[PDB]
Amino acid sequence: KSPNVLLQNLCCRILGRSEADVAQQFQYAVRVIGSNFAPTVERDEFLVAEKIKKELIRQRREADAALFSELHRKLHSQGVLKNKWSILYLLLSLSEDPRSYATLFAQALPRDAHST
Amino acid sequence: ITEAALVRDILYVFQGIDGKNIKMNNTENCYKVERSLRDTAVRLSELGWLHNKIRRYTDQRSLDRSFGLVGQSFCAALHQELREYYRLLSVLHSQLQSLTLRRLLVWTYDPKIRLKTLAALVDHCQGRKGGELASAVHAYTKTGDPYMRSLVQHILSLVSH
Amino acid sequence: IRRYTDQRSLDRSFGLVGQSFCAALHQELREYYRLLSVLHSQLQLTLRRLLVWTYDPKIRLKTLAALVDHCQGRKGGELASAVHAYTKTGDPYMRSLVQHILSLVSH
Amino acid sequence: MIHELLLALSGYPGSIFTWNKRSGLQVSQDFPFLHPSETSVLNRLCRLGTDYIRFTEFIEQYTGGLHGIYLRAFCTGLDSVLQPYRQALLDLEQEFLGDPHLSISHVNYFLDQFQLLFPSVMVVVEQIKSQKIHGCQILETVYKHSCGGLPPVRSALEKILAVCHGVMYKQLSAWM
Amino acid sequence: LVEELEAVGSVLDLLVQLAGSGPPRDYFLNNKHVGRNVPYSGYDCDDLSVFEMDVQSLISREECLCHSMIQETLQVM
Amino acid sequence: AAAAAANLNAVRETMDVLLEISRILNTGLDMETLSICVRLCEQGINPEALSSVIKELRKATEALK
Amino acid sequence: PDDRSWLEHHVVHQYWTARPSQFPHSLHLHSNLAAVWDQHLYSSDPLYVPDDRVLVTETQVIRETLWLLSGVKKLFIFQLIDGKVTVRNNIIVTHLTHS
Amino acid sequence: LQQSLELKRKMLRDKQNKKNSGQHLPIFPAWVYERPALIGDFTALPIGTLPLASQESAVVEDLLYVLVGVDGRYVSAQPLAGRQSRTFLVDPNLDLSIRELVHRILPVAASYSAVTRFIEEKSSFEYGQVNHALAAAMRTLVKEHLILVSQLEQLHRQGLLSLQKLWFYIQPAMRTMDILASLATSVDKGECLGGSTLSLLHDRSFSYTGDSQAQELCLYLTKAASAPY
C-alpha cells in the first residue's frame, strides 16, 4: 500500500493495542523513520551474508553457518527479490541467540568520498 | 578466453579433480595454468593440493583391517570432515547457472586452515595403530588457538572409542 | 600542517599528550581528505574555478597552522598550557574547533 | 538428468552409462552441456552403484546350487540395510521435482555416507562368494567385520546377525 | 502544535484532506564561520547545490519576467 | 492469470527462504508482521531506522503489560 | 464444436490415436536430458536416420502400467503377440532418452 | 628465506633440554614452508602514452590485486624478504602525479606482507600456545581486511572507484596495519616467545591512548594472548 498507512499496520501488528490506545509511540516512530527512506550507503548483499556468517560463528553454530550458504543460494535461484540487502540486514539487526568488538570489523562505505 | 570458464575449472580442483583449462602438472607441486589473473590461480588450487593427501589416505586405510579398528576410527573422522568440505562446493556449483569474488579467496580462506591442520595430522598419524595412534592425535591439542583445539578434539573422541 | 604532524608522531619526548594532540591532528589530516575527495569525484566541478571551496577551509587550515607554530616549541603538559589560549581567542571559529580538540586531549 | 543417474546406480545404465557385469557404470563421454570433469565426479559416485547391483544379485539367489537356510537369513538382513538406500533415493527425486537449479554435485555430495557403507560391506560379500561359505562358519566371518572400525559397517551387520541367530533359535528349540 | 492542541479534532480531519488544494540568504544556510558550533563537515556539493537553487528560485521568476513582458505585448500589439 | 501465479509461486519460495533465515535469527516478528516489513523493504527502507523503532515497541508491548 | 471441444479438452487424445503430442515444457538441462542427448547424437553425425517414436509424456506410462499390473491387458501399450509380452518402442519422454 | 629453518630448530632444542620428561616437539611437513603461494604478497602495454583518467582506472585495478596478494599488472611485489620487509616496483613510466600518490598508498601493502608471514612461521609448536593465540587473532584481522576489498571491487566495476576515493578508504586502516607490522618485526627480531611476548604486548597495550584507534586493537590482542597463560 502507501507507506504512511503501512506504518500504522506495523503499530497494530507488534502491539496488542490499537492506535486509539497510545499515540505517543507513533509520533516518535514518525520522528525516527522520516528522512530515512533511502540507503545512503552501499547495498552489497555479499557483505551482509558474510556478516551473518560472522554472527553465527559468534554463536558457535558452524552447521547453521553452512546451511546459510544453501539458503543464500535459494535467493539466487529465484532472483525475484529486488533488494536482497535490505531484508537480510533487517533480519540481522534483530538478531537473537537462542543459546564486544563489532564496529571494528567490516561495514558498508559511508559515501563521504562521493556526492550523496 | 573468459574468466567464468576458469571459475568452473577451479571449482573442481578443490575436490582434487582437474578442471578443463587448469589441470594438474607435477604431482608434488600445485596446479599449473595451461597477467595478474593468471598468477592468482596457483594460490587457489593449493587447497585442493592439501585435499589430495587427506583424501587418498582416508580412502585406502578405511578398507584395512591390518591397520586395525583404531585407524579405521580415525578414517571415519577424516571422511566425516571431508563431507563438510564438499557441502560448500555444492553450493558454489549451483550458485552459477564474467564474475569473481576475488576469485573466491574470501570463501576459501577459512577452509584453507581447516585443511592445513589435517595435512599435518595425517602425517603425524602415519603408520601407527592403537594407543600409539592416539598419542599422535594427542600432540596437536596442546594449542592456544580455539579453532585448532576445536578441530582436533572431535577426532580424538572418535579414535578413543 | 602535515609536516608538523609528520615530525611529532616520531617524538617520544613530545609526550603521550603530544601524541594525543598529534592524533587529534591526524583526524584533521583525514578531514583534508574528506574535503577534496568529492571535489575530485564531480570532475567529469567548476564553481568560479572552485573559489567557494577555499573559503570554508583556508580558515580550518588557518586555525590549525597557528598551533603548528605556536605549539611548536613545547613538549608535554606545557603544551596543554597553550591549547587553552585558543578557546579564549575572539574568533568564534577557532574557539569551537579547539573546544573539541582539547576534549580529546584532556583524556 | 538427475533421474537417469538415480536409475544408473540402481541398474538400467541407459546411454549415458555403459554397464559391465564385472565392474560397471563406465562413463567416458565428452559433455559440452556439462563440464568434462563431471565424468570423474561421476566415477567417484559410480563406485556405490556397482556395489548395490552386486548386492541385489546376491539377494536374488536366496530370498552353482547351494543348500542352507543361513543364506536365506543373511540375505534377509541385507534387505533391511538396503531400505535406507531406497529412501535416500526417493528424497532426491522429490527435491528435483520442485527445485530447478540442483545438479549432479548435490547427489554426489549427499550420497557420500554410502561410499563408506557399500565399499566396506562389499569385501564381506565378495569374501563369501570368492571362497564359498555356506556352513555355520559364515557367522564367524560376519563377527570379524561387525567389529567394524567405521560406524556404517560396524552397525549394519549387527542387524543381520541377530536374524541369523533367530533362525537358529528355531533349530535349537526343536532340538531342546 | 497538534500535541498541545490535544492537551477541534474535526478541524484537523478537515485539514488533512484540504492539504493539496493550496497554491500550485538570511545568515544561516551553510554558515560555518560564526557560532559556538564545531566547524567539522565533509563535502558533497548537495548542501551547496541546493544553496545555488535558493538563488536560482529568485532568478527563475526574475528571468521569466523578461520573457513574459515582450510575448505578452506582442500578442496584443 | 496463470503466469502471474507461477511468478507468485517463485515468490512464495523466496518468502519461505527468508522465513528460515527469520526463524534462525529468532525475530519476534511472525509471518504476518514480517509481511509488512517486506512491503516496506520493497519501497526502499533503512532497516537501521526500522530496527530502532521495532526494538522499542517490542519493549513497549511489555511496558504497559 | 460443443461435444468435440469438451472431448478435446478433458480427454488427452495424444498417445492412443493418430495425433502428435503437445504439452507445455520447462526446458533447460536438469529435466531436458532426452532433447539434449538427441542434439548431441545428431551433432556427432550417426548419420542421422531417427527412431520412430511419437513422444508420450511421463504420467501416461504410470496409468498404463497400473492397468497392466491390475490384471487387465490389451491396452494401447503392452500388447500380446501369442500371449508373450512385448513393449512398444514408440515411447520416449522429454527426459531419460528411452534407454 | 633460508634462515627460518635455523630459528625453528634452535628453539626446538631449548624445550628439549628444559624438560627431560617431555620428548619430541611436533613439526609441520615441509610443504608448509616450501610453497611461497600460501602467503599473501609475493602482457604490459606502455601505460604512459594513455590518457590520465584511464591510467587511474588501470593502476587502481592492479593495486587492488596487489593488496590481498598476487603480483599485479603494472605494480609488482618484489622478492626482497630480508626480515619483515616488502618492496614494490611500479613500472617506471607512470605519470609522476599519479605515481607519487601510488607510492603514498603502497606502505599498507608492505604492512600486509609483513603480517601474513608471521602467521605462517610462528604458528608451529616451537613458538607455543601464546604465539598460537596471538597469530590466531591476527589472522582474523587479515580476514576482515579481505572482506573490504570485495566491496571495493564491486565499486570499481561500475566505474566509480578512483584513486582519491581509494586513498580515502584505506585512511582508517593504515594506522592499524602499521601497528601490526611493527609488532611482528619486534617479535621476530628479539626471538620472543611464551611470556617474553606477553611483556611486550602489555607494554604496547599501555602505549596507545591517542585516539582509541590502536588501543582497541592491542587490547584485543593482549586479551587473546593471555588465555593460554
SS3 H2: coil
Determine the residue of chain D that is closest to A77 in CA distance. Answer: D101
Secondary structure tally for chain F: helices H, strands E: 3, 0
CA-to-CA distance for F55 and H82, rounded, in angstroms? 54
C-alpha count within 13 angstroms, C-beta hemisphere, residue H53: 7
Residue B24 corresponds to which amino acid? M
B to D CB pairs, distance under 8 Å: 67
SS3 F62: coil
CB C34 within 8 A of CB E42: yes
- The DSSP code for B55 is H
Take residue H38 and report the three cell numbers written for it: 600460501
E8: which residues sit within 8 A by CB, 6+ positions away?
none
Secondary structure (H, E, C), chain E: CHHHHCCCHHHHHHHCCCCCCCCCCCCCCCCCCCCCCCCCCCCCCCCCHHHHHHHHHHHHHHHHHHHCCHHHHHCCC
CA-to-CA distance for D53 and D10, rounded, in angstroms? 6
CB D139 within 8 A of CB D103: no
Examine residue B82 and say whether the peptide bond preceding it is cis (omega within 30 degrees of 0): no
Instruction: Check if E4 contacts A (Cβ < 8 Å).
Output: no
For B110, G87, H69, the CA distances from G68, given in Å and listed in that order, are 57, 12, 67
Contact of chains A and C by CB distance (3 or more pairs under 8 angstroms): yes
SS3 C61: helix
Length of chain E as a residue count:
77
In sign, the C-alpha dihedral spanning G54, G59, G62, G64 is: negative
CB H73 within 8 A of CB H47: no
Residues B88, A76: C-beta atoms closer than 8 Å: no
Closest to C97 measured CA to CA, from C54, C65, C75: C65
CA-to-CA distance for H36 and C35, rounded, in angstroms? 42
CA-to-CA distance for F31 and C33, rounded, in angstroms? 47
The four Cα atoms C93, C96, C101, C107 give a dihedral, to 10 degrees, of 160
Name the residue among F45, F50, F61 with its Cβ closest to that of A15. F61
CA-to-CA distance for B156 and B153, rounded, in angstroms? 5
Cβ-in-10-Å burial (0-12, 13-18, 19+) of A46 comes to: middle
Grid cell 563406465 in the structure block, residue: D26
Q: Subunits that touch chain C (at least 3 Cβ pairs < 8 angstroms)?
A: A, E, H
Grid cell 608471521 in the structure block, residue: H118
Residues A38, F17: C-beta atoms closer than 8 Å: no
Work out the end-to-end distance of chain E between its first and last CA atoms, rounded to an integer number of angstroms. 53
Grid cell 533349530 in the structure block, residue: D171
Residues of H in contact with A104 (CB under 8 A): 144, 216-217, 220
Query: How far does the CA of residue A111 sit from the closest CA of chain C (Å)?
Result: 9
Residues of E in contact with C36 (CB under 8 A): 43
CA-to-CA distance for B157 and D53, rounded, in angstroms? 35
Q: Angle CA(A61)–CA(A63)–CA(A66) in degrees, nearest 5?
A: 115
User: 10 Å Cβ neighbour count for D8?
Assistant: 24
Take residue A78 and report the three cell numbers written for it: 529465484
CB D43 within 8 A of CB B12: no
Secondary structure (H, E, C), D3-50: CCHHHHCCCCCCCCCECCCCCCCECCCCCCCCCCCHHHHHHHHHHHHH
CA-to-CA distance for B124 and B142, rounded, in angstroms? 14
> Crossing angle, helix B105-124 and helix B146-159, to 10 degrees?
50
CA-to-CA distance for H218 and H229, rounded, in angstroms? 17
Residues of A in contact with E45 (CB under 8 A): 115
Instruction: Check if H210 contacts C (Cβ < 8 Å).
Output: yes
Q: Are strands G79-80 and G85-86 parallel, antiparallel or unpaired?
A: antiparallel
Query: How far does the CA of residue E25 sit from the closest CA of chain A (Å)?
Result: 23
Closest to D27 measured CA to CA, from D13, D37, D12, D16: D16
Q: Angle CA(B28)–CA(B6)–CA(D42) in degrees, nearest 5?
A: 75
Residue H139 corresponds to which amino acid? R
Take residue H34 and report the three cell numbers written for it: 616450501
G79: which residues sit within 8 A by CB, 6+ positions away?
G73, G86, G88
Name the residue among G28, G31, G99 with its Cβ closest to that of D14. G99
Residues A114, C34: C-beta atoms closer than 8 Å: no
Work out the end-to-end distance of chain D between its first and last CA atoms, rounded to an integer number of angstroms. 58
CA-to-CA distance for D139 and D153, rounded, in angstroms? 15
Residue to mutate among D99, D105, D143, with most B CBs inside 10 A, is: D105
Take residue C102 and report the three cell numbers written for it: 582539547
Could you list the beta-strand ranges (E) of B18-76. Answer: 22-23, 32-33
Query: How far does the CA of residue H123 sit from the closest CA of chain C (Å)?
Result: 32
CA-to-CA distance for C57 and C36, rounded, in angstroms? 11
Instruction: Check if C38 contacts E (Cβ < 8 Å).
Output: yes
Phi and psi of H144, rounded to 5°?
A: -70, -20
Residues D1, G28: C-beta atoms closer than 8 Å: no
Length of chain C as a residue count:
107
For C28, C45, E45, H159, the CA distances from C40, given in Å and listed in that order, are 19, 8, 11, 14
Residues H132, B146: C-beta atoms closer than 8 Å: no
Contact of chains B and F by CB distance (3 or more pairs under 8 angstroms): no
CA-to-CA distance for A29 and A23, rounded, in angstroms? 10
User: Which residues of B, range 99-128, sit inside 8 Å of H by Cβ?
Assistant: 100-102, 105-106, 109-110, 112-113, 116, 119-120, 123-124
Residues of A in contact with E44 (CB under 8 A): 112, 115-116
CA-to-CA distance for D21 and D19, rounded, in angstroms? 7
SS3 B32: strand
In terms of C-beta distances under 8 Å and separation of at least 24 residues, what long-range contacts does A96-105 make, across chains too? A96/F25, A96/F26, A96/F27, A97/A59, A97/F26, A98/F26, A101/H216, A101/H220, A104/H144, A104/H216, A104/H217, A104/H220, A105/A54, A105/H144, A105/H147
CA-to-CA distance for G55 and G53, rounded, in angstroms? 6
Interior/surface letters C27-40, b for 16+ CB within 10 angstroms, e for the rest: bbeebbbbbbbbbb
Q: Could you tell me which residues are beta bridge partners of residue C74? A: C72
Taking only Cα atoms into account, the Rg of chain B, rounded to an integer number of angstroms, comes to 17
User: 10 Å Cβ neighbour count for G14?
Assistant: 17
- The DSSP code for H90 is E
Closest to C24 measured CA to CA, from C105, C85, C86: C105
Interior/surface letters D149-158, b for 16+ CB within 10 angstroms, e for the rest: bbbbbbebbe
CA-to-CA distance for G25 and B13, rounded, in angstroms? 35
Cβ-in-10-Å burial (0-12, 13-18, 19+) of F61 comes to: middle
Query: How far does the CA of residue H168 sit from the closest CA of chain C (Å)?
Result: 6
SS3 H159: coil
Q: Could you tell me which residues are beta bridge partners of residue C72? A: C74
Chain-centroid distance, C-alpha B126: 17
Chain-centroid distance, C-alpha E52: 12
Work out the end-to-end distance of chain C between its first and last CA atoms, rounded to an integer number of angstroms. 23
C-alpha count within 13 angstroms, C-beta hemisphere, residue C45: 20
Take residue C20 and report the three cell numbers written for it: 594525543
CA-to-CA distance for B157 and F49, rounded, in angstroms? 47
Grid cell 552441456 in the structure block, residue: D33
Closest to G25 measured CA to CA, from G99, G95, G97: G95
In sign, the C-alpha dihedral spanning A6, A10, A16, A19 is: negative
Closest to D56 measured CA to CA, from D88, D17, D23, D82: D82
Take residue H52 and report the three cell numbers written for it: 590520465
CA-to-CA distance for F64 and E14, rounded, in angstroms? 33
Query: How far does the CA of residue A33 sit from the closest CA of chain H (Å)?
Result: 27
User: 10 Å Cβ neighbour count for H123?
Assistant: 23
CA-to-CA distance for C4 and H8, rounded, in angstroms? 43
CA-to-CA distance for B74 and B69, rounded, in angstroms? 9
For D25, E12, H148, H154, the CA distances from B101, given in Å and listed in that order, are 37, 56, 11, 9
Grid cell 556526492 in the structure block, residue: A115
Instruction: Check if H151 contacts A (Cβ < 8 Å).
Output: yes
Query: How far does the CA of residue C33 sit from the closest CA of chain H (Å)?
Result: 6
Secondary structure tally for chain A: helices H, strands E: 5, 0
Grid cell 563431471 in the structure block, residue: D38
Secondary structure (H, E, C), D57-109: HHHHHCCCCCCCCCHHHHHHHHHHHHHHHHHHHHHHHHHHHHCCCCCHHHHHH
CB B83 within 8 A of CB D112: yes
Residue D78 corresponds to which amino acid? L
Q: Subunits that touch chain H (at least 3 Cβ pairs < 8 angstroms)?
A: A, B, C
H146: which residues sit within 8 A by CB, 6+ positions away?
B102, B105, B106, B109, H68
CA-to-CA distance for G27 and G30, rounded, in angstroms? 8
CA-to-CA distance for B154 and B134, rounded, in angstroms? 13
Interior/surface letters A68-107, b for 16+ CB within 10 angstroms, e for the rest: bbbbbbbbbbbeebebbbbbbbbbbbbbeeeeeeeeeebe
Residues of E in contact with A115 (CB under 8 A): 44-46
Closest to D52 measured CA to CA, from D80, D22, D85: D85
Residues of E in contact with A27 (CB under 8 A): 3
CA-to-CA distance for A8 and G73, rounded, in angstroms? 66
F44: which residues sit within 8 A by CB, 6+ positions away?
A37, A38, A39, A83, A86
Q: Angle CA(B117)–CA(B121)–CA(B122) in degrees, nearest 5?
A: 125
Grid cell 567405521 in the structure block, residue: D150
Query: How far does the CA of residue A116 sit from the closest CA of chain C (Å)?
Result: 10
CA-to-CA distance for A17 and H99, rounded, in angstroms? 65
CA-to-CA distance for A44 and F10, rounded, in angstroms? 23
Reported as type and span, the H/E element at residue C16 is none
CA-to-CA distance for D8 and D15, rounded, in angstroms? 10
Phi and psi of C72, rounded to 5°?
A: -95, 105
CB A23 within 8 A of CB A42: no
H24: which residues sit within 8 A by CB, 6+ positions away?
none
Residues of C in contact with H167 (CB under 8 A): 33, 37
Residue G61 corresponds to which amino acid? V
Residues C37, A115: C-beta atoms closer than 8 Å: no
- The DSSP code for G29 is G
Take residue D9 and report the three cell numbers written for it: 546406480
Take residue A59 and report the three cell numbers written for it: 554463536
Interior/surface letters H84-120, b for 16+ CB within 10 angstroms, e for the rest: bebebebbeebeeebbebbeebbbbbbbbbbbbbbbb
Length of chain G as a residue count:
99
Cβ-in-10-Å burial (0-12, 13-18, 19+) of G81 comes to: exposed
Interior/surface letters H32-44, b for 16+ CB within 10 angstroms, e for the rest: bbeeebbbbbbee
